[PDB]
């Protein structure tokens, strides 16, 4: 096969994340929230399904902001506890189809890690997948080409990649690539999107959250 490795040296470098504690998850929430808020007017204008009522971005932003506010007032090193705080804030602030779905995605994500103090890349992936399950079960009649589709494709990318990727930065980068591909495909699933010439507004809002998650993993601010 290969050279048998036996070196006592430990690999170098700083730009990698092995474990996510409660303050890194808080930073992901905060930066995700801020990135969404900065894009809310755009996400509103994209809204066409089920009605073109100009509100997806507002709805998602208000929902996410409720979660963020609870987090910022109640930080913890324990990721499971921080997730309970985030979940509660989303669920007591969910607005619209998109904000309800967002709160259910993150309810299932957070429930999956409730007893953890920190998570690794595999459990980050598993938590995205748990959130997709929760959200699909919450919606009586799921429709494809939507925030659900983008979340599901993102979580299956996460599962696959995490199996051989310990770095949560590299994992989240891949999740975003694959979530973007799914978002760009939404008009091929939901007719009104292709007729109007837009991607799904809920899916776009979710991408905005994920992009902020990556900024936080890199130790950066939106
Ligand atoms: N049945 C559904 N299945 C999946 N996603 C849905 C469904 N209904 C709505 N959505 C999502 O919600 C987004 C619209 O959110 P929003 O504008 O907040 O809804 P509304 O103003 O109709 O309450 C859609 O672009 C889509 O992502
Ligand atoms: Mg509405
Ligand atoms: Mg709307
Ligand atoms: Mg387990
Ligand atoms: Mg898929
Ligand atoms: Mg890197």
Curated annotation (Swiss-Prot):
Molecular function GO labels: glycerone kinase activity
Any GO BP: glycerol metabolic process
Domain DhaL stretches: 23-215
Organism superkingdom: Bacteria
The protein's name in its UniProt record: Uncharacterized protein SA1069
The organism of origin for this protein: Staphylococcus aureus (strain N315)
Residues shown, of full length: 1 to 207 of 548
């Amino acid at each position: 096969h290969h050279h048998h490795h036996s070196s006592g040296l430990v690999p170098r470098g700083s730009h990698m994340i092995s474990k996510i504690n409660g303050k890194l998850f808080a930073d992901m929430i905060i930066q995700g929230a801020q990135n969404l808020s900065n894009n809310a007017d755009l996400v509103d204008s994209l809204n066409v399904y089920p009605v073109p009522d100009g509100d997806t971005g507002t709805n998602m932003n208000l929902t996410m902001t409720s979660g963020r506010e609870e987090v910022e007032n109640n930080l913890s090193k324990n990721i499971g506890e921080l997730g309970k705080t985030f979940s509660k804030g989303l669920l007591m602030g969910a607005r619209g189809n998109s904000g309800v779905i967002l709160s259910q995605l993150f309810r299932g994500f957070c429930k999956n890690i409730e007893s953890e103090s920190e998570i690794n890349s595999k459990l980050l992936a598993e938590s995205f997948q748990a959130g997709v399950e929760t959200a699909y079960k919450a919606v009586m009649k799921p429709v494809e080409g939507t925030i659900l589709t983008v979340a599901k494709d993102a979580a299956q990318a996460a599962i696959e990649k995490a199996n051989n990727t310990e770095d949560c930065i590299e994992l989240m980068e891949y999740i975003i690539v694959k979530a973007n591909e799914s978002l760009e495909n939404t008009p091929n699933l939901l007719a009104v999107l292709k007729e109007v010439g837009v991607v799904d507004s809920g899916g776009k809002g979710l991408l905005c959250v994920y992009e902020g998650f990556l900024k936080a993993l890199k130790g950066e601010k939106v």
